[PDB]
Symmetry: C2
Subunit: 300 residues, 2 copies
């Protein structure tokens, strides 16, 4: 019992974090095998960030420009390249702590653990979600660029995020481990705004099911809806439309409670057009959207 946002154990990741320095910029890098991954903007100064020519800046660098420290050990950079918005540094040592891993791109609404790091030193771990507008609501301070997001399957670490920057609304943007940003963001000082965000309907539905499991009942009704009519109302209120896969993901929860997915959609539909109006659901007067069906099931 108990609902808590849980992060995966971070030990396999902690073993891959290093500090990368170029000029006066220090940040975090990920040391896998004989490669170190970090945000390419470490090569920029303040004046460069305004409009950086990254090919040009990399051309003017040398192997010896890049300083990589793992704990007390200086690593020797023996090669450098750039893949999308990531720097890749070849070091003359293979990380003996390298776990089994893969690089995966994650989708909006999905969750992952973040090992916040400063000076190549892990500071803390927490769970968060990729928002529809391709940002995350993390907790990053200066020096945290390079911090990684990941999921764990068996002994295989799936890396899915590397932190690059904080937007002006206080949310966070980064890339997958191929260096491709999530969303339409770029590693430049240009005015950048995340698109207007939407609510992760799938997770709200999971939260509603959890609320029923825990005895909350007042939002249910006898009203009927089709998927299409539900999605039309959902989009009107800045909720994500429900997908086919989504309905099936909710199957277990519907069986467990005996409430059909579309009936729960009917309940949510009403909540959107009226409001909750000061009635609590699971103790809160706002709907939560960062708790997934996988979270509810595994903890119920």
């Amino acid at each position: 019992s108990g609902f808590r946002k849980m992060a995966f154990p971070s030990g396999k990741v902690e073993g891959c974090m290093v500090q990368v320095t170029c000029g006066t910029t220090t940040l975090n890098g990920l040391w896998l095998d004989d490669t170190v991954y970090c945000p390419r903007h470490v090569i920029c100064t303040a004046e460069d960030m305004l409009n950086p020519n990254y090919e040009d800046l990399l051309i003017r660098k040398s192997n010896h420009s890049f300083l990589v420290q793992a704990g007390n050990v200086q690593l020797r950079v023996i090669g450098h390249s750039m893949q999308n918005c990531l720097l890749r540094l070849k070091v003359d040592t293979s990380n003996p702590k390298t776990p089994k891993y893969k690089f995966v791109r994650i989708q909006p609404g999905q969750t992952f653990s973040v090992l916040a790091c400063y000076n190549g030193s892990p500071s803390g771990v927490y769970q968060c979600a990729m928002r529809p507008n391709h940002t995350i609501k993390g907790s990053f301070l200066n020096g945290s660029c390079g911090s990684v997001g990941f999921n764990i399957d068996y002994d295989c670490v799936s890396f899915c995020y590397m932190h690059h920057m904080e937007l002006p609304t206080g949310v966070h943007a980064g890339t997958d481990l191929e260096g491709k940003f999530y969303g339409p963001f770029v590693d430049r000082q240009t005015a950048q705004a995340a698109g207007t965000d939407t609510t992760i309907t799938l997770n709200v539905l999971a939260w509603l099911y959890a609320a029923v499991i825990n005895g909350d009942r007042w939002f249910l009704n006898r009203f009927t809806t089709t998927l299409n009519d539900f999605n039309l109302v959902a989009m009107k209120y800045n909720y994500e439309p429900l997908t086919q896969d989504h309905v099936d993901i909710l199957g277990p929860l519907s069986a467990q409670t005996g409430i059909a997915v579309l009936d729960m959609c009917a309940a949510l539909k009403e909540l959107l057009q009226n409001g909750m109006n000061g009635r609590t659901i699971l103790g809160s007067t706002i709907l939560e959207d960062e708790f997934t069906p996988f979270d509810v099931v595994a903890q119920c």
Copy 2:
């Protein structure tokens, strides 16, 4: 910026987790140097849990009754002793991955990280607080017993909690690493309730500061209060009394934000007496009390 419930990196503890089996009871154990610590109710059968005499049940066991497994390796039990509600198993090999460590008994209102484990295998990590009523609001399922709470300071791991059971209400109860329970609980399968919980005032005030540091000051007001007048309201709303020592602990947050502690108390008083006026604070419709002043400084400095 941003504000998040954050746990310590769990690497150093992960390498201390082992599995302990006695009969068909398997649960988690903590392997430091040549000792494995685990809850003593691993020695009990189904019958035994109802009215256990642990001295009696332990003396009937051998070293060979205990199967200790670290991943692939098997460790050999070469001794045992009971300490309060823990069993301390001596093993033939010392843990090569033993961190620098200390056992501390944390106080209500303090936070720690929990590494929830299953069959000696770490599953998740999260942060929580010792409740004033000596329970924790954790997330535990069957098989989690022996999962540990800890803090990390620099290079030293302070272990403070081992999980023993879930209460009827769904809250969790356990011991420090000398086996003494937090609270009035015992490791016996009978129905046990906690006392009435209170809200950790110090922590709520820290989190209001965090909210301000994160650019949300909507709940501030022009008023102030005396310590004594705040404490009458606290008492009415089931909050812990604020002391001068508590006020002192908030000094740095007060200094950083430029909001005096008693002025933040005024804001809190108004929040308690009127409600949150349909608004959120740091994304929450509830006043959060599981971040300490220390946790806030660490994350917002």
